[PDB]
Coordinates of C-alpha atoms in Angstrom, one line a residue:
Chain A
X28 CA -35.1 24.7 34.4
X29 CA -33.3 22.6 31.4
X30 CA -30.6 20.2 32.5
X31 CA -27.2 20.2 31.7
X32 CA -25.8 17.5 29.8
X33 CA -21.9 16.6 28.9
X34 CA -22.5 15.3 25.1
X35 CA -23.6 18.2 23.4
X36 CA -24.3 16.4 20.3
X37 CA -26.9 14.1 20.6
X38 CA -26.8 10.3 19.5
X39 CA -29.2 8.0 17.3
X40 CA -29.9 4.7 18.9
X41 CA -30.9 1.3 18.0
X42 CA -33.9 1.6 20.1
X43 CA -33.4 -1.7 22.1
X44 CA -36.4 -2.9 24.3
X45 CA -33.6 -4.9 25.6
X46 CA -32.3 -1.9 27.1
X47 CA -34.4 1.3 29.3
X48 CA -36.8 3.1 27.2
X49 CA -36.5 6.8 27.2
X50 CA -39.3 8.7 29.0
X51 CA -41.5 8.5 25.8
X52 CA -44.6 10.2 26.2
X53 CA -45.4 13.5 24.0
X54 CA -46.4 16.7 25.2
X55 CA -49.8 15.6 25.2
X56 CA -49.5 13.1 27.4
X57 CA -47.2 15.7 29.5
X58 CA -50.1 18.3 29.4
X59 CA -52.7 15.7 30.4
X60 CA -51.0 14.1 33.1
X61 CA -50.5 17.8 34.5
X62 CA -54.3 18.2 34.6
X63 CA -54.5 14.7 36.0
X64 CA -52.1 15.8 39.0
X65 CA -53.9 19.0 39.3
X66 CA -57.3 17.3 39.5
Chain B
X39 CA 20.5 -31.6 -12.2
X40 CA 21.4 -28.0 -11.1
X41 CA 19.5 -25.5 -9.2
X42 CA 17.9 -22.2 -10.7
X43 CA 20.6 -20.1 -9.7
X44 CA 22.1 -16.5 -11.0
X45 CA 25.8 -16.5 -12.4
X46 CA 27.7 -13.5 -11.5
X47 CA 31.2 -12.7 -12.9
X48 CA 33.4 -10.3 -11.8
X49 CA 35.1 -8.0 -14.4
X50 CA 38.1 -6.5 -12.5
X51 CA 41.1 -8.6 -11.7
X52 CA 40.3 -11.1 -8.8
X53 CA 43.2 -11.9 -6.2
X54 CA 43.7 -14.4 -3.5
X55 CA 43.1 -12.3 -0.2
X56 CA 39.9 -10.7 -1.8
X57 CA 38.3 -14.4 -2.9
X58 CA 39.6 -15.3 0.9
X59 CA 37.7 -12.0 2.1
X60 CA 34.8 -12.7 -0.1
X61 CA 34.0 -16.5 1.1
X62 CA 33.6 -15.5 4.7
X63 CA 30.1 -14.2 3.3
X64 CA 28.6 -17.7 2.1
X65 CA 25.1 -17.5 2.8
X66 CA 24.7 -13.6 3.0
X67 CA 21.6 -11.4 1.7
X68 CA 22.3 -9.3 -1.6
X69 CA 20.4 -7.4 -3.8
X70 CA 20.0 -7.4 -7.4
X71 CA 17.9 -5.0 -9.6
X72 CA 16.3 -7.3 -11.6
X73 CA 16.7 -11.1 -11.8
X74 CA 18.6 -11.7 -15.1
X75 CA 20.9 -14.8 -15.3
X76 CA 24.4 -13.1 -15.8
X77 CA 25.0 -10.0 -14.1
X78 CA 27.9 -7.7 -13.9
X79 CA 29.8 -6.9 -10.8
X80 CA 28.3 -3.5 -10.6
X81 CA 25.2 -5.0 -9.7
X82 CA 26.0 -6.5 -6.3
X83 CA 24.7 -4.2 -3.7
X84 CA 23.8 -0.4 -3.2
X85 CA 26.7 1.1 -4.4
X86 CA 25.3 1.8 -8.0
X87 CA 23.0 4.0 -5.8
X88 CA 25.3 5.6 -3.6
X89 CA 24.4 9.2 -4.0
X90 CA 25.4 12.7 -2.1
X91 CA 22.5 14.9 -2.7
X92 CA 20.1 12.3 -1.8
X93 CA 20.2 9.8 1.0
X94 CA 18.3 7.3 3.3
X95 CA 14.9 7.4 2.5
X96 CA 15.6 7.1 -1.4
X97 CA 17.5 3.9 -0.5
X98 CA 14.7 2.8 1.5
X99 CA 12.3 3.3 -1.6
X100 CA 14.8 1.3 -4.0
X101 CA 15.1 -1.6 -1.6
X102 CA 11.8 -2.2 -1.2
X103 CA 10.9 -3.4 -4.1
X104 CA 14.6 -4.5 -4.9
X105 CA 15.0 -8.5 -5.8
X106 CA 16.9 -9.5 -3.0
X107 CA 18.9 -12.6 -3.5
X108 CA 21.4 -15.2 -1.4
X109 CA 25.2 -16.3 -2.3
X110 CA 25.6 -20.0 -2.5
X111 CA 29.4 -20.8 -3.8
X112 CA 32.6 -18.6 -4.5
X113 CA 34.8 -19.6 -7.3
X114 CA 37.1 -18.6 -9.7
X115 CA 34.9 -15.9 -12.7
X116 CA 31.5 -16.7 -11.5
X117 CA 29.5 -16.5 -7.9
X118 CA 26.6 -18.4 -8.0
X119 CA 23.6 -16.5 -6.5
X120 CA 20.3 -18.4 -5.2
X121 CA 17.1 -16.9 -5.6
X122 CA 14.8 -17.8 -2.8
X123 CA 11.3 -18.8 -3.1
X124 CA 8.4 -17.9 -0.8
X125 CA 7.8 -21.1 1.4
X126 CA 11.6 -22.5 1.6
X127 CA 14.0 -22.5 4.7
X128 CA 17.5 -20.7 3.8
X129 CA 20.6 -19.8 5.9
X130 CA 21.3 -16.6 6.0
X131 CA 24.1 -14.5 7.6
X132 CA 23.9 -11.7 10.2
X133 CA 25.9 -9.0 8.6
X134 CA 23.9 -6.7 11.2
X135 CA 25.0 -5.2 14.5
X136 CA 22.4 -7.1 16.7
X137 CA 22.0 -11.0 17.2
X138 CA 18.8 -12.2 16.7
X139 CA 16.3 -14.5 18.3
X140 CA 14.0 -17.6 17.5
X141 CA 10.9 -15.8 16.2
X142 CA 12.1 -12.4 15.2
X143 CA 10.5 -11.1 12.2
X144 CA 13.1 -9.8 9.8
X145 CA 13.4 -7.2 7.1
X146 CA 15.9 -5.6 5.0
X147 CA 17.1 -2.0 5.6
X148 CA 19.9 0.1 4.1
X149 CA 23.2 0.5 5.9
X150 CA 23.5 3.5 7.8
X151 CA 27.2 4.1 7.1
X152 CA 28.0 5.6 3.6
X153 CA 30.8 5.0 1.6
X154 CA 32.9 7.4 3.8
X155 CA 33.2 5.0 6.9
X156 CA 36.5 4.0 8.8
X157 CA 35.3 0.8 10.1
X158 CA 34.4 -1.2 7.2
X159 CA 36.9 -3.7 5.7
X160 CA 34.6 -4.8 2.8
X161 CA 35.3 -6.1 -1.1
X162 CA 37.2 -3.2 -2.4
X163 CA 38.1 -2.3 -6.0
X164 CA 39.5 0.8 -7.9
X165 CA 36.0 2.6 -7.8
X166 CA 33.7 -0.4 -7.1
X167 CA 33.0 -0.7 -2.9
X168 CA 30.8 -3.7 -1.9
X169 CA 28.0 -3.0 0.7
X170 CA 25.5 -5.1 2.1
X171 CA 22.4 -4.1 3.4
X172 CA 21.5 -5.7 7.4
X173 CA 18.5 -7.6 8.5
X174 CA 17.2 -6.1 11.7
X175 CA 14.6 -7.4 13.7
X176 CA 11.4 -6.0 12.6
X177 CA 10.9 -3.7 15.8
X178 CA 14.2 -2.1 15.1
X179 CA 13.4 -1.3 11.6
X180 CA 10.0 0.4 12.8
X181 CA 12.0 2.3 15.7
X182 CA 14.4 3.3 13.2
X183 CA 12.0 4.5 10.3
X184 CA 9.9 6.5 13.1
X185 CA 12.8 8.2 15.1
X186 CA 14.3 9.1 11.8
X187 CA 11.2 10.6 10.6
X188 CA 10.7 12.4 13.8
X189 CA 14.1 13.8 14.2
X190 CA 13.8 14.6 10.4
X191 CA 10.7 16.7 11.3
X192 CA 12.8 19.1 13.0
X193 CA 15.1 19.9 10.5
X194 CA 14.2 23.5 10.3
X195 CA 14.9 24.9 13.3
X196 CA 17.7 23.6 15.2
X197 CA 18.9 27.1 16.2
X198 CA 17.1 26.4 19.7
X199 CA 19.0 24.6 22.4
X200 CA 15.9 22.5 23.7
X201 CA 15.4 21.2 20.1
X202 CA 19.1 20.2 20.0
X203 CA 18.2 18.1 23.5
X204 CA 15.6 16.6 21.7
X205 CA 17.7 15.5 18.7
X206 CA 20.9 14.5 20.6
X207 CA 18.7 12.5 23.1
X208 CA 16.6 11.2 19.7
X209 CA 20.0 10.5 17.8
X210 CA 20.6 7.0 19.7
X211 CA 18.2 4.0 19.6
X212 CA 18.2 1.3 22.6
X213 CA 18.0 -2.3 21.8
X214 CA 19.5 -5.5 23.4
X215 CA 22.7 -5.0 24.1
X216 CA 22.5 -1.8 21.5
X217 CA 23.8 1.7 22.1
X218 CA 23.9 2.1 18.5
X219 CA 23.3 5.5 17.4
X220 CA 21.8 6.6 14.1
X221 CA 23.6 9.9 12.1
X222 CA 21.6 13.3 11.6
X223 CA 19.6 13.6 8.3
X224 CA 20.6 17.6 8.5
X225 CA 24.0 17.8 7.2
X226 CA 25.3 21.4 7.4
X227 CA 21.8 23.2 7.4
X228 CA 20.3 21.7 4.3
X229 CA 18.1 18.8 3.8
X230 CA 18.1 15.8 1.4
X231 CA 14.9 16.2 -0.7
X232 CA 13.6 13.1 -0.7
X233 CA 13.1 13.2 3.1
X234 CA 12.2 16.8 3.1
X235 CA 9.2 15.3 0.6
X236 CA 8.3 12.4 3.3
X237 CA 7.7 15.2 6.2
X238 CA 6.3 17.6 3.8
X239 CA 3.6 15.1 2.8
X240 CA 3.2 14.0 6.5
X241 CA 2.3 17.0 7.6
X242 CA 0.3 17.8 4.6
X243 CA -2.1 14.6 4.8
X244 CA -2.4 16.1 8.8
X245 CA -3.4 19.5 8.0
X246 CA -6.1 18.4 5.0
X247 CA -7.4 15.5 7.5
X248 CA -7.5 18.3 10.2
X249 CA -9.2 20.9 8.0
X250 CA -11.7 19.2 5.5
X251 CA -13.4 16.7 8.0
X252 CA -15.7 19.2 9.8
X253 CA -17.3 20.5 6.5
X254 CA -17.7 17.0 5.3
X255 CA -19.5 15.8 8.7
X256 CA -21.4 18.9 8.4
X257 CA -22.7 17.7 5.0
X258 CA -22.8 14.0 6.3
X259 CA -25.2 14.8 9.4
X260 CA -28.5 13.9 7.6
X261 CA -27.5 10.5 6.9
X262 CA -27.2 9.4 10.5
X263 CA -28.5 5.9 11.2
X264 CA -25.3 4.5 13.1
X265 CA -23.9 5.5 16.3
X266 CA -20.8 6.8 15.3
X267 CA -20.9 9.9 13.2
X268 CA -22.1 11.9 16.2
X269 CA -19.2 11.3 18.1
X270 CA -16.9 11.6 15.2
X271 CA -18.6 15.4 15.0
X272 CA -18.5 15.5 18.9
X273 CA -14.8 14.9 18.4
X274 CA -14.4 17.9 16.0
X275 CA -16.6 20.4 18.5
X276 CA -14.3 19.1 21.0
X277 CA -11.0 20.5 19.4
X278 CA -11.8 23.9 19.1
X279 CA -12.5 24.2 23.2
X280 CA -16.2 26.5 -0.1
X281 CA -15.6 26.2 -3.8
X282 CA -16.1 22.6 -5.3
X283 CA -13.0 22.8 -7.4
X284 CA -10.9 23.7 -4.4
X285 CA -12.4 20.5 -2.1
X286 CA -11.8 18.4 -5.2
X287 CA -8.1 19.2 -5.8
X288 CA -7.6 19.1 -2.2
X289 CA -9.4 15.5 -2.0
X290 CA -7.4 14.3 -4.8
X291 CA -4.3 15.8 -3.4
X292 CA -5.3 13.7 0.0
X293 CA -5.2 10.6 -1.4
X294 CA -2.0 11.2 -3.6
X295 CA -0.2 12.6 -0.8
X296 CA -1.5 9.5 1.2
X297 CA -0.2 7.1 -1.7
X298 CA 3.2 8.5 -1.6
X299 CA 3.2 7.5 1.8
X300 CA 3.3 3.6 1.5
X301 CA 6.7 3.2 1.6
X302 CA 6.7 4.5 5.0
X303 CA 3.6 3.4 6.5
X304 CA 3.9 0.0 5.6
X305 CA 6.5 -2.6 5.0
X306 CA 6.4 -6.6 4.4
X307 CA 8.8 -8.8 6.6
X308 CA 11.2 -10.7 4.5
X309 CA 12.6 -13.4 6.6
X310 CA 11.9 -15.0 10.0
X311 CA 13.8 -17.1 12.0
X312 CA 13.5 -20.6 12.5
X313 CA 16.8 -21.3 14.7
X314 CA 19.8 -19.0 15.6
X315 CA 23.5 -21.0 15.5
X316 CA 25.6 -20.8 18.4
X317 CA 27.6 -17.4 18.3
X318 CA 24.7 -15.9 16.8
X319 CA 26.7 -15.2 13.2
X320 CA 24.5 -17.3 11.4
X321 CA 20.3 -18.5 11.4
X322 CA 18.2 -20.6 9.3
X323 CA 15.4 -18.1 8.3
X324 CA 12.1 -19.3 6.2
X325 CA 11.7 -16.7 3.5
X326 CA 8.6 -15.1 3.2
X327 CA 7.9 -12.8 0.3
Chain C
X101 CA -14.9 -33.6 1.8
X102 CA -11.7 -34.2 -0.2
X103 CA -8.7 -31.7 -0.8
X104 CA -8.6 -28.5 -2.7
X105 CA -8.0 -29.8 -6.7
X106 CA -5.4 -27.9 -8.4
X107 CA -6.3 -29.6 -11.7
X108 CA -10.0 -28.6 -12.8
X109 CA -11.6 -29.6 -16.0
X110 CA -13.9 -27.5 -17.3
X111 CA -16.8 -28.5 -19.7
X112 CA -19.0 -27.1 -22.1
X113 CA -22.5 -28.5 -22.8
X114 CA -23.7 -26.5 -25.9
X115 CA -22.5 -27.1 -29.5
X116 CA -18.9 -25.4 -30.4
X117 CA -18.1 -24.2 -33.7
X118 CA -14.5 -24.0 -35.1
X119 CA -14.5 -20.3 -34.4
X120 CA -15.1 -20.3 -30.7
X121 CA -12.6 -22.8 -29.9
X122 CA -9.6 -21.0 -32.2
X123 CA -11.4 -17.6 -30.1
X124 CA -10.7 -19.8 -27.0
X125 CA -7.1 -21.0 -28.3
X126 CA -5.8 -17.1 -27.8
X127 CA -7.2 -17.4 -24.0
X128 CA -4.6 -20.1 -22.8
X129 CA -2.3 -19.0 -20.1
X130 CA -4.5 -16.7 -18.7
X131 CA -7.1 -15.8 -16.0
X132 CA -10.5 -16.7 -15.3
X133 CA -12.5 -16.3 -12.2
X134 CA -14.4 -19.3 -10.7
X135 CA -16.3 -19.5 -7.3
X136 CA -16.5 -23.3 -6.9
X137 CA -13.2 -25.0 -6.7
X138 CA -14.7 -28.6 -7.7
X139 CA -13.3 -30.8 -10.2
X140 CA -15.3 -31.2 -13.3
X141 CA -17.2 -27.5 -13.0
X142 CA -19.7 -26.5 -15.9
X143 CA -19.2 -23.4 -18.0
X144 CA -21.8 -21.8 -15.7
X145 CA -19.5 -21.2 -13.3
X146 CA -16.4 -20.1 -15.4
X147 CA -16.3 -16.6 -15.4
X148 CA -18.2 -13.4 -14.4
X149 CA -20.9 -13.3 -16.6
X150 CA -22.9 -15.2 -13.9
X151 CA -22.9 -12.0 -11.8
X152 CA -23.9 -9.1 -14.2
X153 CA -26.9 -7.3 -12.5
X154 CA -29.1 -4.1 -13.5
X155 CA -27.5 -2.0 -11.0
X156 CA -23.6 -2.9 -12.3
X157 CA -22.5 -1.5 -9.1
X158 CA -19.0 -1.6 -9.6
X159 CA -17.6 -1.5 -6.1
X160 CA -19.7 -4.7 -5.4
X161 CA -18.4 -6.2 -8.4
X162 CA -15.0 -5.4 -7.1
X163 CA -15.8 -7.2 -3.8
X164 CA -17.0 -10.0 -5.2
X165 CA -14.3 -10.7 -7.4
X166 CA -11.7 -10.1 -4.6
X167 CA -13.6 -13.0 -2.7
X168 CA -13.8 -15.0 -5.9
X169 CA -10.9 -18.1 -6.5
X170 CA -8.7 -17.0 -9.0
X171 CA -7.0 -19.6 -11.5
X172 CA -5.1 -20.0 -14.7
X173 CA -6.2 -21.4 -18.2
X174 CA -4.3 -24.3 -19.4
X175 CA -4.6 -26.6 -22.4
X176 CA -7.8 -25.8 -24.2
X177 CA -9.2 -28.5 -26.3
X178 CA -12.5 -30.0 -27.7
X179 CA -14.6 -29.2 -24.8
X180 CA -12.6 -29.6 -22.1
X181 CA -10.6 -26.7 -19.9
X182 CA -7.8 -27.6 -17.7
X183 CA -7.5 -25.2 -15.0
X184 CA -4.3 -24.8 -12.6
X185 CA -5.1 -22.7 -9.7
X186 CA -1.9 -21.8 -8.4
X187 CA 0.1 -22.1 -5.0
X188 CA 1.8 -19.3 -3.2
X189 CA 4.9 -18.6 -4.5
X190 CA 5.7 -20.6 -7.8
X191 CA 5.9 -19.1 -11.2
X192 CA 4.3 -18.9 -14.6
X193 CA 2.8 -16.8 -17.0
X194 CA -0.4 -14.6 -17.6
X195 CA -1.7 -12.6 -20.5
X196 CA -2.9 -9.1 -20.7
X197 CA -6.7 -8.2 -21.5
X198 CA -6.9 -4.8 -20.7
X199 CA -5.5 -2.5 -23.3
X200 CA -2.3 -1.6 -20.8
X201 CA 0.8 -2.0 -21.7
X202 CA 3.2 -3.5 -18.8
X203 CA 6.5 -2.7 -17.5
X204 CA 8.7 -4.5 -15.2
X205 CA 8.1 -4.6 -11.1
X206 CA 5.1 -2.9 -11.0
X207 CA 2.7 -5.4 -9.3
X208 CA -0.7 -6.1 -11.3
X209 CA -4.4 -7.0 -9.8
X210 CA -7.5 -8.1 -10.5
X211 CA -10.5 -5.6 -11.8
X212 CA -13.8 -6.1 -13.3
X213 CA -13.9 -4.9 -16.9
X214 CA -14.7 -1.2 -17.0
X215 CA -17.6 -0.1 -19.3
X216 CA -18.5 -3.7 -20.1
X217 CA -21.2 -3.8 -22.7
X218 CA -21.9 -3.4 -26.5
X219 CA -20.1 0.2 -26.2
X220 CA -16.4 -1.2 -26.5
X221 CA -17.1 -4.3 -28.7
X222 CA -16.0 -7.3 -26.7
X223 CA -17.0 -10.1 -28.7
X224 CA -15.9 -13.1 -25.9
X225 CA -17.8 -16.3 -26.7
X226 CA -21.8 -15.5 -26.9
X227 CA -23.5 -18.8 -26.3
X228 CA -27.1 -19.3 -24.7
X229 CA -27.2 -15.8 -23.4
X230 CA -23.9 -16.4 -21.7
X231 CA -20.9 -14.5 -22.5
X232 CA -17.4 -15.1 -21.1
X233 CA -16.0 -12.2 -19.1
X234 CA -12.7 -12.2 -18.3
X235 CA -11.3 -9.8 -15.3
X236 CA -8.7 -7.1 -16.7
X237 CA -5.3 -7.5 -15.3
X238 CA -4.2 -3.8 -14.4
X239 CA -1.1 -2.8 -12.6
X240 CA -1.5 -1.0 -9.4
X241 CA -1.4 2.4 -10.8
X242 CA -4.6 2.0 -12.7
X243 CA -6.1 -0.2 -9.6
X244 CA -5.3 2.7 -7.1
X245 CA -6.5 5.4 -9.5
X246 CA -9.9 3.7 -9.7
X247 CA -10.4 2.7 -6.5
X248 CA -9.5 6.6 -5.4
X249 CA -11.7 8.0 -8.1
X250 CA -14.7 5.9 -6.8
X251 CA -14.1 7.4 -3.2
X252 CA -14.3 10.5 -4.2
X253 CA -17.2 10.2 -6.1
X254 CA -19.0 8.5 -3.2
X255 CA -17.8 11.3 -1.3
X256 CA -19.0 14.0 -3.5
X257 CA -22.5 12.9 -3.7
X258 CA -23.8 15.0 -0.7
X259 CA -25.8 18.1 -0.5
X260 CA -24.2 19.4 -4.2
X261 CA -26.7 19.7 -6.7
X262 CA -26.8 17.3 -9.4
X263 CA -26.1 19.6 -11.8
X264 CA -22.4 20.1 -9.8
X265 CA -22.0 16.4 -10.0
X266 CA -22.5 16.2 -13.6
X267 CA -20.1 19.2 -14.0
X268 CA -17.3 17.0 -11.9
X269 CA -17.9 13.7 -13.6
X270 CA -16.3 15.6 -17.1
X271 CA -13.1 16.2 -14.9
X272 CA -13.2 13.2 -12.6
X273 CA -14.3 10.3 -15.5
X274 CA -11.0 10.9 -17.5
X275 CA -7.8 8.5 -16.5
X276 CA -5.2 8.7 -19.0
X277 CA -2.7 6.0 -17.4
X278 CA -0.1 5.2 -20.3
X279 CA -1.5 6.8 -23.3
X280 CA -4.9 5.2 -23.1
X281 CA -8.4 6.5 -22.2
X282 CA -10.4 5.2 -19.4
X283 CA -13.7 6.0 -18.3
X284 CA -15.4 5.0 -15.0
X285 CA -18.7 3.3 -15.2
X286 CA -21.9 4.6 -13.2
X287 CA -21.3 6.4 -10.2
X288 CA -24.0 5.3 -7.8
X289 CA -24.7 5.2 -4.0
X290 CA -25.1 1.8 -3.1
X291 CA -24.4 0.1 0.3
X292 CA -20.8 -0.7 0.1
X293 CA -19.9 2.6 -0.9
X294 CA -21.4 4.0 2.3
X295 CA -19.9 1.7 4.4
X296 CA -16.4 2.3 3.0
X297 CA -17.4 6.0 3.3
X298 CA -18.3 5.4 7.2
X299 CA -14.6 3.5 7.3
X300 CA -12.9 6.6 5.5
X301 CA -15.0 9.4 7.8
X302 CA -14.1 7.5 11.1
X303 CA -10.4 7.1 9.8
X304 CA -9.9 10.6 8.4
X305 CA -11.3 12.2 11.8
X306 CA -9.4 9.9 14.2
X307 CA -5.8 11.1 12.3
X308 CA -7.0 14.5 12.6
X309 CA -7.4 13.5 16.4
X310 CA -3.9 11.9 16.4
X311 CA -1.7 14.7 14.9
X312 CA 0.4 16.8 17.1
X313 CA 1.4 20.8 17.3
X314 CA 4.3 19.9 15.0
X315 CA 2.2 18.5 11.9
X316 CA 0.0 21.2 12.3
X317 CA 2.8 24.1 12.1
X318 CA 5.2 22.3 10.0
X319 CA 4.1 23.8 6.8
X320 CA 3.8 27.1 8.4
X321 CA 7.3 27.2 9.4
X322 CA 8.9 25.8 6.2
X323 CA 6.6 28.1 4.0
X324 CA 8.2 30.8 5.4
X325 CA 11.7 30.9 4.5
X326 CA 11.8 28.0 1.8
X327 CA 10.3 29.0 -1.9
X328 CA 10.4 25.4 -3.7
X329 CA 7.8 24.8 -6.3
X330 CA 6.4 21.7 -4.6
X331 CA 5.5 24.4 -1.7
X332 CA 4.3 26.4 -4.8
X333 CA 1.8 23.6 -5.5
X334 CA 1.1 22.6 -1.7
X335 CA 0.8 26.4 0.2
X336 CA -2.2 27.2 -1.7
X337 CA -4.6 24.5 -0.5
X338 CA -4.8 25.7 2.9
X339 CA -5.8 28.9 4.9
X340 CA -3.9 32.3 5.8
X341 CA -2.8 31.6 9.3
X342 CA 11.3 34.0 14.6
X343 CA 8.7 31.8 15.7
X344 CA 9.8 29.8 19.1
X345 CA 7.8 26.5 19.6
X346 CA 5.9 26.4 22.9
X347 CA 6.7 22.7 23.8
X348 CA 8.6 19.6 22.3
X349 CA 9.0 16.3 23.7
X350 CA 10.0 12.9 21.6
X351 CA 9.0 10.3 24.1
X352 CA 5.4 10.7 23.3
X353 CA 5.8 11.7 19.9
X354 CA 7.0 8.2 19.0
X355 CA 3.5 6.4 20.4
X356 CA 1.6 9.4 18.6
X357 CA 3.2 8.8 15.4
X358 CA 3.2 5.0 15.9
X359 CA -0.8 5.7 16.3
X360 CA -0.7 8.0 13.3
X361 CA 0.9 5.1 11.4
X362 CA -1.8 2.7 12.2
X363 CA -4.4 4.9 11.4
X364 CA -2.8 5.7 7.9
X365 CA -2.6 1.8 7.5
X366 CA -6.4 2.0 8.2
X367 CA -6.9 4.1 5.7
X368 CA -4.5 2.5 3.1
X369 CA -6.4 -0.5 3.0
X370 CA -9.8 1.5 1.3
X371 CA -7.7 1.9 -2.0
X372 CA -4.9 -0.9 -2.3
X373 CA -6.9 -4.2 -2.4
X374 CA -3.7 -6.6 -2.4
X375 CA -0.6 -7.0 -4.5
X376 CA -2.0 -10.3 -6.8
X377 CA 0.8 -10.9 -9.2
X378 CA 4.3 -9.4 -9.4
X379 CA 5.9 -9.2 -12.9
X380 CA 9.5 -10.8 -13.5
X381 CA 10.2 -10.0 -17.1
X382 CA 7.8 -9.2 -20.3
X383 CA 7.9 -10.3 -23.7
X384 CA 8.5 -7.8 -26.7
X385 CA 5.2 -7.8 -27.3
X386 CA 3.9 -7.2 -24.0
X387 CA 0.8 -9.5 -24.6
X388 CA 2.5 -12.2 -22.2
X389 CA 4.6 -12.0 -18.8
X390 CA 6.3 -14.4 -16.6
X391 CA 5.0 -13.6 -13.3
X392 CA 5.4 -14.5 -9.3
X393 CA 2.7 -14.8 -6.5
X394 CA 1.2 -17.2 -8.7
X395 CA -2.4 -16.7 -7.1

């Protein structure tokens, strides 16, 4: 299920909003959206 | 008024043929140990430092802090040497092997041929023998120092055939009309000591750097605020695919083995060319020291 | 704006006793640092005592005095000081202030004074809570040892306990260059030393990358047959593990050692500041020396 990335060690970012943001919903919002896509 | 020169005497007797040979070198580069005002003739060049068990790299160490000078006028009993200053232009003779061009960076370099030599016709005395460091362009000096360090790094395993091919194709240099070759640092399978110290310190800083940086980025991975450290240790995890006193002594050894390599990893350009006279035996180089 | 003035007249505003001007007559033909390079600057710009902080970060003071503009003192008189900021290549004299005797041939550098305070008894022109703090002129062994020990003290401050760094400073803060004791003042983690640590980390990783197999196995092919006492000292600082090598190519090792040279140059500037004064010939009391590379 989990993906396979090339760079094995993860990178700290400047967190530019000028770039694209990175999938920033936590596990609560994931489980809630699971319930909303369910019902 | 006169100019701030260095008088130089000659203790041995001088003949008219020797003065006629000496007056070819009007504006020639000459090194001096310390800038006094009356020097003897045993302090004109590197023949006070020519030795058997020591070789090229010791001469490079002595030459880089030697206070060089230019001859001005030859006459009876006295040789007027001119001390060049930073920011004036000076005529300088090309006693070297290669012609220069307009704009080449020029630096001193000891002669590759020792006292035993068949091609020299220089100022010769009963024991004293005038030698003179060449001035080559800085790409040639970098290439000579680099190729000599590489073919001195193979001073231990000359039994094999492929390393003989590597050294004998590395024994020569390729420059502008130059099939010039440089002699081997290995003489009869024992190495001069300071070349051994140079390549030993090279391998030592290499092995220390390749061993301790992984432990230090393990200790550094908690302060990660910039995007450089993660790829810095991604390199170390890519390569494979502790008591405090020992690493303290290791780090001090790292910096001192680096600090003994300043003569090799850098050197300063001495002259630089403003123009080249016709027939390429002279140039009017502005000093830069 | 007009040209840079080589002649700079200083001026005190407060009263001066006879003892202060007498103590200042010894400082003729010596270095004072200034940031201004105007013509008639006051004494507030003269020297380091406009820059002493609570933190006393010595690497920060080293950088700020590196950025500073040097000059030599000339012909002190009643409430005037002529300063001669020198041109690149001429020749006049300087005067030591730190307790380092000088020889010939060794280049000099500018360093802020170590262990500065009332512990070492420097009675230099105290007036109106303004002292005159001169930079020390040390030869390049002392400067390299100070910057090297500041770099190892910046490296050592990670993941080891405070007791281990306090047990290492008694081995590391001592310097005995030319029969005189020198103590490193206050090793602390500021911003500039961690910036220099970042540059050192990148340079040491890249010189670890750009090494070939022969620089790896040189000491392992040399320590098998040769027994030198330098090899006795150099063997023990590695790990444990005739022998024909696998591959060899000089026309690749040329550029590989060229890049290792440029990385060693990029590590070398973290310790060597610059050549600032070269000494020609010293006096028989070593308290004054004529020097080239004047400024």
